[PDB]
């Protein structure tokens, strides 16, 4: 019910600004704050600060000193944030959160329903989207009745890559693995799934693979 | 500022088992503790705020305790889909300041991983490269060693693997490996073999097609 939805991921130049919304539903928008938290690939979680949805009021984090800034549109339930002048150390993914903290001073403060999050990467690199290659189930793929096929998603930037599998349809048994980088500063990665040899004429496996920061979206049907 | 120092990193236990994080403050900030579950891929989710109270929704094997500067979160039977990472945050005064996480790994039984390999496809052979993918499915625990090799040569270059997170229902891990060659070397030779060691082996399996 109550969800917060948020701009996709985007690669930004060292010193460029961005910005990045952040829309609610299934509450009042103005009744709450929205609070900003970015996470650095590999450690952990920090406030940037937070806006009022009623009020207008923003109170920020000291360090982004007069980089970052919070607005809301009441019409669109939406929030936004943008941090200008952007640095190398910047990239990480940028969380927005529905905050309770009233005039009322109790401990039931918190964030709570947080977006699903933003990837920020900040680099000089040129953006490419991934080439997508099917891995076939054959008999070098079968144990026990069981096949495994998948999709290469290779030579990307930046991450990240989603995949689906049956436009969301087929889940149980999937695997999506970590990106590796290549000797050439170009991610890749795999998606595979498990499913029932028997049923391979039967059933159609087609991998959903969007790269937003190209905006990219490749389709490919994985057959035996 | 206020530093919430969370008291183990990591920690691994068992389906069942009862686990206690601790999350210390640098000052007294009464019971404006909040606790965060984090599993891998997903945003952080409220579990726990003012110390104990549970958020509807969050099973009951979860709990809070203490006021002052020390706070413990305690699962008392976990469970597999409790893989993740749990912070503390104070709500005392701004900057509400997070701890740094806890690790949290389930423990499980041996499990041999299913090897699998994927010749190039056609489509990417048009380009010039070959990659050449193994697959190693639902094993436990992390430790597997994938070797490559070209007819019956070990390879030594151009290798990339990568490891999951641990599953959320079945606690183990799969691992991806990539040989990738210029078209030119994929055709100079005839067999390619996956090498794998894992602990649920009795010695290392080799899984191999003909190009
Ligand atoms: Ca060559
Ligand atoms: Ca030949």
């Known amino acids: 019910e109550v969800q917060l939805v948020e701009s996709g991921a985007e690669v930004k130049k060292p010193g460029a600004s961005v910005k990045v919304s952040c829309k609610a539903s299934?509450?009042?928008?103005?009744?709450?704050?929205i609070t900003w938290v970015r996470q650095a690939p590999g450690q952990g979680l920090e406030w940037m600060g937070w806006?009022?949805?009623?009020?207008?009021?923003?109170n920020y984090a000291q360090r982004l000193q007069g980089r970052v800034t919070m607005t809301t549109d009441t019409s669109t339930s939406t929030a936004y944030m943008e941090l200008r002048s952007l640095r190398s150390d910047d990239t990480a993914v940028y969380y927005c959160?529905?905050?309770?903290?009233?005039?009322?001073?109790?401990?039931?403060?918190?964030?709570?329903?947080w977006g699903q999050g933003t990837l920020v990467t900040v680099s000089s690199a040129s953006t490419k989207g991934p080439s997508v290659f099917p891995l076939a189930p054959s008999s070098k793929s079968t144990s026990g009745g069981t096949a495994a096929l998948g999709c290469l998603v290779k030579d990307y930037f930046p991450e990240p890559v989603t995949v689906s599998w049956n436009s969301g349809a087929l889940t149980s048994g999937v695997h999506t693995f970590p990106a590796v980088l290549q000797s050439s500063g170009l991610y890749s990665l795999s998606s595979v799934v498990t499913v029932p040899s028997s049923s391979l004429g039967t059933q159609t496996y087609i991998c959903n693979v969007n790269h937003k920061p190209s905006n990219t979206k490749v389709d490919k049907r994985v057959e035996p | 500022d206020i530093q919430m120092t969370q008291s183990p990193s990591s920690l691994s236990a068992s389906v069942g088992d009862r686990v206690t994080i601790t999350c210390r403050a640098s000052?007294?900030?009464?019971?404006?503790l909040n606790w965060y579950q984090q599993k891998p891929g997903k945003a952080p989710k409220l579990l726990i705020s003012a110390t104990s109270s549970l958020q509807s929704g969050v099973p009951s094997r979860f709990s809070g305790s203490g006021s002052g500067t020390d706070f413990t979160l305690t699962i008392s039977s976990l469970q597999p889909d409790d893989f993740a990472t749990y912070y503390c945050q104070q709500s005392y005064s701004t900057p509400w300041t997070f701890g740094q996480g806890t690790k949290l790994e389930i423990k499980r039984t041996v499990a041999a991983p299913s090897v699998f390999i994927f010749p190039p496809s056609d489509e990417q052979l048009k380009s010039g490269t070959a990659s050449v993918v193994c697959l190693l499915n639902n094993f436990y625990p992390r430790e597997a060693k994938v070797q490559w090799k070209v007819d019956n040569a070990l390879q030594s270059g151009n290798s990339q693997e990568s490891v999951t997170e641990q599953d959320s229902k079945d606690s183990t891990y799969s691992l991806s490996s990539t040989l990738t060659l210029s078209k030119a070397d994929y055709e100079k030779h005839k067999v390619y073999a996956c090498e794998v060691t894992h602990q649920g082996l009795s010695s290392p399996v080799t899984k191999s097609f003909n190009r």
């Open positions: 000052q007294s900030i009464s019971n404006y």
């Open positions: 299934g509450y009042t928008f103005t009744s709450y704050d």
């Open positions: 959160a529905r905050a309770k903290h009233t005039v009322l001073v109790t401990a039931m403060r918190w964030f709570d329903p």
């Open positions: 806006i009022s949805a009623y009020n207008g009021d923003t």
